[PDB]
Design a protein around this ligand. Sequence first.
Ligand SMILES: CNC(=O)[C@H](Cc1c[nH]c2ccccc12)NC(=O)[C@@H](CC(=O)NO)CC(C)C
Ligand SMILES: [Zn+2]
Length: 747
Amino acid sequence: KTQEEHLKEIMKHIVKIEVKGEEAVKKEAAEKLLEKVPSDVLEMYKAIGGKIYIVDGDITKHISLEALSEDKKKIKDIYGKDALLHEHYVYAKEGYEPVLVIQSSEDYVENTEKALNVYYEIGKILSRDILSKINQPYQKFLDVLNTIKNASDSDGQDLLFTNQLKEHPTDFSVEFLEQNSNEVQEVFAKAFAYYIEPQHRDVLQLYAPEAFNYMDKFNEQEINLSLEELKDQRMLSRYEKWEKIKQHYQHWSDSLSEEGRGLLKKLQIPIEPKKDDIIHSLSQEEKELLKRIQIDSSDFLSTEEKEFLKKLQIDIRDSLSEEEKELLNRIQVDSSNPLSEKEKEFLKKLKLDIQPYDINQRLQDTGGLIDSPSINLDVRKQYKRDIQNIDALLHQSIGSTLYNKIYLYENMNINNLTATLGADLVDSTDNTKINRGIFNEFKKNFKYSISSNYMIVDINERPALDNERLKWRIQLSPDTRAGYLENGKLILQRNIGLEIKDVQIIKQSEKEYIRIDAKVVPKSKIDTKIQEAQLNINQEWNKALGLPKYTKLITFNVHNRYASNIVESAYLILNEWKNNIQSDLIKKVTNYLVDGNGRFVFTDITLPNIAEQYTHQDEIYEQVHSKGLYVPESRSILLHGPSKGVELRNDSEGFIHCFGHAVDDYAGYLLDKNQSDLVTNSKKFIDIFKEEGSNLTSYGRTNEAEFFAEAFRLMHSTDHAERLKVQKNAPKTFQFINDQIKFIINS
Ligand SMILES: CNC(=O)[C@H](Cc1c[nH]c2ccccc12)NC(=O)[C@@H](CC(=O)NO)CC(C)C
Ligand SMILES: [Zn+2]
């Protein structure tokens, strides 16, 4: 009866009968007709100012449809056969003041033909009058249309298509759907009708199963999100929602201190480095070294950082002028492009000091592991104080008596999730369309997400920045804690859990975006999934490599918004790895690793924050962050997913490159089993690098190990051509490596 109530409330509100004889049997008859339509499509019609009129005799003879034009007075039935309006039993008047007219009859229980037509007209209202206001149907329903057209049995077409669509060769492109607006809306109406009229439902499932499934899933679940999105379009609706939430947090807001307000503020605007401070905290000796070191010569500083640094030299220019040029004039050419040890150390210490104070970034980088010793102790503690405090400020949950389900919105840049994919998300030709191919890949294994920092969301959806093609629709839990912001936003507590309920391409303001429907759940529920996954992937590969049953080789250090993908991609990476390297080369090397308690860490927090690396660092500034990294001391391969390595097709290439470094380790172990050195450091190799140390990837031209690793990787790619490349361009190395693989396999 939870449903029953909702009906009459709305029905007697939008539905008005006007008959002759006893209006008890006639009303209860027409009511039996509407009760079969999804409760929500009735409320969406109310929203756009629609009303339903049940009358006797000719329908054209009614107040509303009175001002109707003579021309259109010729509508076709569900089967597309003309029939004049003053002779029909239904009609849905379009326009910005929607009206629905139906003749009185109870035989609808028998005459399924009329009922099917009434629902047809209604479906027409849903697609043409309602959903169009929120750019629907779109790609999803479009896919159904194509599944239906190219399918084997062509009956599904004869059932829902018109000869207009029946003749179109190629699939229906997004553009098609745009210029053929009414056509698509038509199919929707017909599918809706057949699915709603109890008697024709089977015919739909028989000839057009995909269409049945779509309307089935739409009418049961997804219909409510449509209502929600339609409401989001309405002024009074948006401000009524914002006000209840504001009211709910009024006490909390009214008690916020100035200190509190200040904390929330810097959470929104990071503090940038003060050029002044920088210099001062240098050193009488150091300042000397910075006056002319070239920041452009570094390979560990982002241009972003470089630009800033060089602007510090320029600000030291004071006394004894002559110096200025003797330095500018004595360092540029005869000194050259190359490098310098002692001073690069200086730049690595400065990198740390010139990072902006960004609380959210810190949580994201560390996955919430705020004690990570990846930055100087002084700032680490400052971050910990502000964080602990923010956790205490956002204590009140969203649950209220003023409302039930509540959706909050977040616009996001895809690079923040997967840079490697964000490179081709947008269509290169037309920047307003989404590359369907990347879409499917991105969507692939995206089942759950994690928030380790403080998410900032909008109460009502708002337009995104140019580089934000991701639009999240999140259903909060009444348990979720948050803070209210005057500008119509909420700051959510850290360590939230998110299940991905749906992912689809949607149009808005002439551009396409990726709508992500998510539901907030306990972070423990997601973590448990990750942990069961780790257990699974280890049993599986322990068996494939012949390792003791309970060894801990593979580890998931997952804490961010693309969580599920890090886990699932790990399986795929390890596969390209075995199917591209000598099964016996793997075993000896990983066995060696396991002996040293090594690990294969797949993570989404920055590498400087993985213990497998930081616990073996002499100095903090010596840390390294990148796509992949091999650590000899811990004997582990670290792979950071979110990133995009310097032109390396995928994560696999990256993982393999690191395994290369591992080989250079074991092989180097076999030579001087009495010492700890790399076979890549051997003289016999130093020379080869002096000759072929340029015949490969620009990167390989960095140094010994790097060269060996890149060569190794190529020699194992999936594109066999790349294997030959080293063959015909780095012969010396090719052999050296293949000798190395034997010198391990056999020993
Ligand atoms: C964004 N990912 C990248 O392309 C960075 C770039 C980089 C080089 N040196 C650095 C020092 C500090 C921070 C970043 C870098 N490099 C890497 O990931 C390389 C890491 C490596 O050589 N591991 O053994 C693997 C290589 C095949 C891409
Ligand atoms: Zn390397």
